[PDB]
């Protein structure tokens, strides 16, 4: 039936209430996440095919990169609150994996400052109640789905995307099967 459980997606054993409709997990430390985001542009293509009223939620995770990973989760919370995801995603990916010039919390801050977010603004967001709660939000969502690895995507807290079960003969076909699967699951 073109979409089968256990193929293009799997079904969570214990679904998550109150989860975002479409939730993606990633790490700035994970090469596959870099691929997912800047090479295959999966997020952007999934977004393009989402039904009306359905937002694409993206959360960062802690388990890679030690203390810096946790610092990056807090930084992503800042990016979310200020709405500057599209201005920091690439230079954070490149700073960690390409140039490897992100070695401390201060280096993360430097990226935001060069992207146009002022130091006073960044530090205020960093210490804000909203970023504090967004950090907990990202951590809880990961625990709630019993996250095993990144990148990963979840629909309505019930469905885990399974690209390993999709057609990968060509990348354009693959990305569109991914987006269509997300779209299908969102109406399910």
């Amino acid at each position: 039936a073109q979409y089968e459980d256990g193929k293009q997606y799997t079904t969570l054993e214990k679904p998550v209430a109150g989860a975002p409709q479409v939730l993606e997990f990633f790490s700035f430390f994970c090469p596959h996440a870099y691929q997912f985001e800047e090479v295959l542009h999966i997020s952007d293509n999934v977004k393009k095919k989402l039904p009306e009223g359905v937002k694409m939620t993206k959360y960062h995770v802690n388990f890679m990169g030690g203390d810096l990973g946790k610092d990056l989760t807090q930084a992503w919370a800042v990016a979310m609150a200020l709405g500057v995801e599209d201005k920091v995603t690439v230079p954070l990916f490149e700073g960690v994996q390409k140039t490897q010039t992100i070695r401390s919390a201060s280096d993360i801050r430097d990226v935001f400052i060069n992207a146009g977010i002022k130091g006073e603004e960044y530090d205020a967001a960093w210490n804000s109640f909203v970023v504090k709660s967004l950090v907990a939000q990202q951590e809880k969502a990961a625990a709630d789905v019993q996250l095993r690895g990144v990148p990963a995507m979840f629909v309505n807290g019930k469905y885990q995307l399974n690209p390993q079960g999709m057609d990968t003969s060509n990348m354009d076909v693959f990305v569109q099967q991914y987006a269509d699967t997300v779209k299908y699951l969102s109406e399910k």
Partner: peptide, 7 residues
């Protein structure tokens, strides 16, 4: 294209 970093 389906690879992941697992915990």
């Amino acid at each position: 294209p389906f690879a992941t970093c697992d915990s």
